[PDB]
Design a protein around this nucleic acid. Structure first.
Length: 183
DNA sequence: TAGGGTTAGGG
């Protein structure tokens, strides 16, 4: 079976009325749910406005994501690939972004290399192999922009990515300022 | 709209 983390989706912006039951009832329309829950406050027991649904397979998760937008209990919710508690620590881990930072690429890396690995995740909009705007020297990293934020999410939850024959690190792209605020 | 008594011992 596939890892639990990869079979689970975070569901944000849940209506105040949504319960484990109403959530399950909606998302079961795209597969077998092995888990479904609405996070509530320990004391007040009130909904925190978000939850999680987990399918028996990633194929079902993908089906659910392909079924966006999702309206549950009259409120449009925001389903996202569940990010592990560990990665949830990294800055910007939960941002809705369409661009990824690809670091550790061989100097001879060309765009076709990036396409050959990343296209399988979604429509690529822009590819930028970074160089020093002065010496023209390759800096060893690129930026790839997709059409759907879920492409980025499907990618960053994986651990390894092979580009131009060798593994590379892929994170969500932070802005010039976000980088600063994280340093 | 980021997790449910779910994260470093004791030899």
């Amino acid at each position: 079976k596939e890892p639990e983390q990869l079979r689970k989706l975070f569901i944000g912006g849940l209506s105040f009325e949504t319960t484990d039951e109403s959530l399950r009832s909606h998302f079961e329309q795209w597969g077998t749910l092995t888990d479904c829950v609405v996070m509530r406050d320990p004391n007040t027991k009130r909904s925190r406005g978000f939850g999680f649904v987990t399918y028996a397979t990633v194929e079902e998760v993908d089906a659910a994501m392909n079924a966006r937008p999702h309206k549950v209990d009259g409120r449009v919710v925001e389903p996202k690939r569940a990010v592990s508690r560990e990665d949830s620590q990294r800055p910007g881990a939960h941002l809705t972004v369409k661009k990824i930072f690809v670091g550790g690429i061989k100097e001879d890396t060309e765009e076709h290399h990036l396409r050959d690995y990343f296209e399988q995740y979604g429509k690529i909009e822009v590819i930028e192999i970074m160089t020093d705007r002065g010496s023209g020297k390759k800096r060893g990293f690129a930026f790839v922009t997709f059409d759907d934020h879920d492409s980025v999410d499907k990618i960053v939850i994986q651990k390894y990515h092979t580009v131009n024959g060798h593994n590379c690190e892929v994170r969500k792209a932070l802005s010039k300022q976000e980088m600063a605020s994280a340093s």
